[PDB]
């Protein structure tokens, strides 16, 4: 713990073809385990992770049917959004949804999750109370007042608070050998000139899982925030992740700088210097 399940749904409308492209992806603890793409051979949800293979035909069919339902839902929402914003015709727009639930180490519910976005910007989202809504802007107020009249909230809460948790449990038990594993980070430091009397020090973390991690540079016992570049954790390509933290150091004083790696699977933090 924590633990989570999330479904990332994207829909992109294309000119001339009044059928939007619908892509939905499901993750557990942030690992992809199911996917559906309407531009596929014969659209149907597919296993992304091994532990999803034990699911019978009934599981897939039902899941795929919902997708067919979302294609519709997203087809109309797009059309409605197109209007709210006085947008033209024959263009390309994006509607995205994030939904799911989180659990503590005990597997009980920590938070319900539901949120939408249009054209890359927050549109409307369910509040942590799973009863109220926050509308990004004017148009979202229309959807907001429209959803409060029908009581959409209660239904989502029903799902997010129950069904969501149940399915997450099953996925968690089915692939626990896969999901519940931790791969500790391996670290090393690289040296690179930056300016006349300035140097670049790069701290590396490789092959760790889950993706979560913290990298810091310190002088004596204080962390460095200035001229300290932190790059976005990236996928190794085999399930593990990589990341590095760089800091600009005066030439000849490197030795007084230390790197530290904090990660779930580490008994204690990794501490290293240049060498």
């Amino acid at each position: 713990g924590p633990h989570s399940m999330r479904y990332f749904e994207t829909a992109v409308s294309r000119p001339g073809l009044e059928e939007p492209r619908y892509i939905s992806v499901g993750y557990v603890d942030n690992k992809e385990f199911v996917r559906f793409d309407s531009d596929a051979e014969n659209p149907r949800y597919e296993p992304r992770a091994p532990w999803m293979e034990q699911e019978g035909p009934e599981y897939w069919e039902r899941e795929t049917q919902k997708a067919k339902g979302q294609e519709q839902w997203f087809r109309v929402s797009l059309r409605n959004l197109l209007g709210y914003y006085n947008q033209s015709a024959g263009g390309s727009h994006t509607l995205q949804q994030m939904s799911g639930c989180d659990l503590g180490s005990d597997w009980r519910l920590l938070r319900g999750y539901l949120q939408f976005a249009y054209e890359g910007r927050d549109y409307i989202a369910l509040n942590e109370d799973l009863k109220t809504w926050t509308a990004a802007d004017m148009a979202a107020q229309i959807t907001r007042r429209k959803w409060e009249q029908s009581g959409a909230a209660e239904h989502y809460k029903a799902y997010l608070e129950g069904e969501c948790v149940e399915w997450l449990h099953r996925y968690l038990k089915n692939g626990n050998a896969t999901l519940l594993r931790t791969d500790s980070p391996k670290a090393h430091v690289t040296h690179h000139p930056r300016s006349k009397g300035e140097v670049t020090l790069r701290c590396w973390a490789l092959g760790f899982y889950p993706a979560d991690i913290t990298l810091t540079w310190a002088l004596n016992g204080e962390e460095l925030t200035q001229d300290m570049e932190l790059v976005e954790t990236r996928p190794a390509g085999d399930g593990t992740f990589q990341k590095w933290a760089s800091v600009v150091v005066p030439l000849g004083k490197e030795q007084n700088y230390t790197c530290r790696v904090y990660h779930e699977g580490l008994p204690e933090p990794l501490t290293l210097r240049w060498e």
């Binding site: 839902w73 409605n80 709210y84 939408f116 549109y123 409307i124 429209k146 029908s150 959409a152 239904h155």
Partner: peptide, 4 residues
């Protein structure tokens, strides 16, 4: 569920 109602649309946007």
């Amino acid at each position: 569920y109602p649309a946007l």
